[PDB]
Amino acid sequence: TASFDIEANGKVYVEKGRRITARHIRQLEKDDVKLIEVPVEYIAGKVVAK
Amino acid sequence: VITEVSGFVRFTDMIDGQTITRQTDELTGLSSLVVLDSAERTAGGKDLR
């Protein structure tokens, strides 16, 4: 699920609280982007590697 | 859940974003409100029922 807003280059792709459908996945394939904006509250749920 | 009396319904201790999730289904028929379970909620709403 998408708990945060996915933003890249001023264009809105998936809003907050929206489910990810394969049409949005195909839009992400057609957009060719690899850098979005992520808030601070999402980082604390990850696990460090080294 | 079935009620025994008929009258006005009011929302008591229901705030959006913490204990209830308002999701929009892709079909036009379903637009309903879901009550969040008391396990995966935040620490600020443990006593809010």
Instruction: State this model's resolution in angstroms.
Output: 3.0
A20 at interface of B, judged by CB pairs closer than 8 A: no
Indicate which technique resolved this structure. Answer: cryo-EM
Q: How far apart are CA B49 and CA B5, in angstroms?
A: 22
Which residues have C-beta within 8 Å of that of residue B34, sequence separation ≥ 6?
A: B20, B21, B22, B23
Closest residue of chain B to A17, computed from CA coordinates: B23
> From the CA of A18, how many Å to the nearest CA of chain B?
8
- Give whole-number Cα distances, B3 to A47, B6, B12, B25, B34, in Å: 48, 7, 17, 27, 20
Q: Which amino acid is at A22?
A: A
Q: How far apart are CA A31 and CA A13, in angstroms?
A: 10
Q: How far apart are CA B13 and CA B47, in angstroms?
A: 10
Q: C-alpha angle B37/B21/A36, rounded to 5°?
A: 110
